[PDB]
RNA sequence: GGUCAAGAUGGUAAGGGCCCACGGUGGAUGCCUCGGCACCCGAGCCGAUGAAGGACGUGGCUACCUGCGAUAAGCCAGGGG
């Protein structure tokens, strides 16, 4: 989903902020999932981490670029 | 064929010794390397933009060895394939 890469690029302020916050939370969800479905979940976890990692890398890009 | 007397040698292993037989432990060692050694060209400074160097981490399932450090079996862009 380098496409997600794009959406990332797109957002920015309290935007990217709240977006990453929520998503991270979703990953919490995952963590709890640690003992349920799990099977197709694997990705959701590794990746999800990765993706929020993206969000982050971005905020750095964005506001650091700013100041 | 039966009795006595006289004379000389006999096989009998508990275990043991020497020789061969087939194994057992013990690794020589013959050969064999992703390991050293010696030289010679290259190369030659890192550090608070908190270094060298370690502590505690994460890899869904992971004690350890690796790599990352909480954005942690790593996210970004560019050069390779």
Curated annotation (Swiss-Prot):
State the gene name recorded for this protein.
Answer: rpmC
What's one Pfam family the UniProt record gives for this protein?
A: Ribosomal_L29
Indicate what this protein is called per its UniProt record: Large ribosomal subunit protein uL29
Q: Name one GO molecular function term.
A: structural constituent of ribosome
| GO CC, one annotated term | cytosolic large ribosomal subunit
Instruction: Tell me the protein family, please.
Output: Belongs to the universal ribosomal protein uL29 family.
What's an example Gene Ontology biological process for this entry? translation
Which ranges does the record mark as transmembrane? none
- Keyword Ribonucleoprotein tagged: yes
Organism's domain of life? Bacteria
